[PDB]
UniProtKB/Swiss-Prot annotation, chains A, B, C:
Residue positions where Phosphoserine is found in the record: 197, 199
Post-translational modification: Phosphorylation on Ser-197 and/or Ser-199 is required for interaction with Smurf.
Compartments, as annotated in UniProt: Cytoplasm; Nucleus
Effect of residue 165 to L: In allele Mad-9; lethal
Organism: Drosophila melanogaster
Annotated tissue distribution: Stage 13 embryos display expression in the dorsal epidermis (at protein level).
The MH2 domain, residue ranges: 5-199
Protein's name in the database: Protein mothers against dpp
Domain of life: Eukaryota
Effect of residue 199 to A: Abolishes interaction with lack
Deletion consequences: Mutants exhibit defects in midgut morphogenesis, imaginal disk development and embryonic dorsal-ventral patterning that are very reminiscent of dpp mutant phenotypes.
Protein purpose: Required for the function of decapentaplegic. May play an important role in mediating Dpp signaling. Involved in the BMP signaling pathway.
Length: 199, 199, 199
């Protein structure tokens, strides 16, 4: 249905770095090398520039290497750690599809794989949370974004508590889900407690 | 003449959020829902991401809803508040076309409408300010951008004094005007007091 | 080989301003006027917006005028100062092709010209630094970006020590070089001292 199944924006700490990548090929790689082809469907982080860069970020960028392979197949998306260092994923849909806390950050060690989005499991939540409120379904908006860190992990068991603390990370928007979510939201009504224009 | 009649970039406070939208359809909507189609010509704010986000911004984003409808017709552009909360517009051309101070921020309450750019009124200023200086016509550059806030207002009568203080707002560039302005500027000469390269 | 020979992003101080321009025409101009055509292959800085802008930046933007002409021919790229004020270039490849320190910032006074990238000279470095390490060739990544300031200079002989200190400047990525560099890096191996995921 959508021209792209995902889009990916990259950051270094809390500052967006480089253009947004959009994916139509079902298999995309985000690596740390230097090819600029927006076509190909390699998202190459290595040729993103940043003068604000520091040593701990430069070092990390040199260990992304092969990076992450993100495979869209039917309704599911899996992420594979091709890099020689681990990646770390925070997916609310995956944290649900299992049984973890919504803020759970999972490790995908090198060579490993993980379903990070379940288009079915999501589809439920959608319907379950329709007759559950409006803001109920607004929050699902949070499920269609997945955050992923290269090398350095964050949260429970690390010093880094926020993804914005990690040197190299990406944000993945799943356009499939967002479109279905959109269909639902456009047929509903604003929250209760209206909103002040001054405060 | 131009491929797009406008482009719109969105911010939350003082940080740009999301990609720039470009408009070729004469009617565009900027709403708070979650459709990613760059085609359609709905600019959907709800699927823009931000970890730096805070509670007062999240709340506002949930009241944008239907948002603003921006209608380009002949030379004029009107803005219509479809949202259940008001939008606030700062248009130098509209502040002139009327008689307000250039920094005047106008409210468009829900259901209301307002001509925010007058392609004629602008056209005058252009000619009047040609034989009025160069920096005279450089400043017109400021007229081709319009800033607009959702829900929270800013300036006179609010605590918020700068648009950068508002949680959710957009910046609209009118490519029609800019092109005509460009035609004029390329035939002129730099300002008087030349410029130091050290200070 | 690449769809674009360069891309250029603009900044004001340390904040990215406006969209990235991509160049396929061998001759591009970056000026300070107001045409939005992404086609043309004029990159027009004057119609980039910024509320965070200050007086010293506004003044500079008004002296860019004709700006810089960047000519890609065969393997070489030359930069010509069309502006009435000088531009300042930091090109690691040019600093090498000559004999300067890598951080050397060169002035191109109005009317002047300068080869800022030598596709041959680069080609050497590439091969020389293959059997010289991996991180050896990773650093070449730094050579394919060129930073350029309008009017105000930076570094040795000025108060401004960092390009991020200059009010108006651009970052140019040479996609030719990056692609060849990419070919090389994808056939190699990560650095020695592996990397901690916690620190």
């Amino acid at each position: 249905e959508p021209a792209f199944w995902a889009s990916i924006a990259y950051y270094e700490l809390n500052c967006r770095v480089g253009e947004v990548f959009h994916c139509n090929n079902n298999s995309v790689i985000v690596d740390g090398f230097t090819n600029p082809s927006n076509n190909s469907d390699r998202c190459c982080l290595g040729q993103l520039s940043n003068v604000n860069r520091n040593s701990t970020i430069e070092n990390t960028r040199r260990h992304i290497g092969k990076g992450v392979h993100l495979y869209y197949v039917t309704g599911e998306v899996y992420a594979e750690c091709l890099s020689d260092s681990a990646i770390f994923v925070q997916s609310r849909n995956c944290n649900y599809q299992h049984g973890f806390h919504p803020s759970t950050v999972c490790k995908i060690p090198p060579g490993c794989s993980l379903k990070i989005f379940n288009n079915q499991e999501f589809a439920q939540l959608l319907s379950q949370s329709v007759n559950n409120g409006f803001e109920a379904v607004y929050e699902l908006t949070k499920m269609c974004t997945i955050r992923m860190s290269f090398v350095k992990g964050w949260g429970a068991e690390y010093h880094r508590q926020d993804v914005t603390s990690t040197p190299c990370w990406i944000e993945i928007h799943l356009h499939g889900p967002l479109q279905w979510l959109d269909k639902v939201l456009t047929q509903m009504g604003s929250p209760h407690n209206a909103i002040s224009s001054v405060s």
